[PDB]
Design a protein around this ligand. Structure first.
Ligand SMILES: [Zn+2]
Length: 29
């Protein structure tokens, strides 16, 4: 699935769950 890291430190979009899941770590630590 595609997801959008529209968060207040990124404003990015990622055409894969693996690419958002691996990136979301950088917004948890
Ligand atoms: Zn992001």
């Amino acid at each position: 699935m595609v997801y959008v890291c529209h968060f207040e430190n990124c404003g990015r979009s990622f055409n894969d769950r693996r690419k958002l899941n691996r990136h979301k770590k950088i917004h948890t630590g």
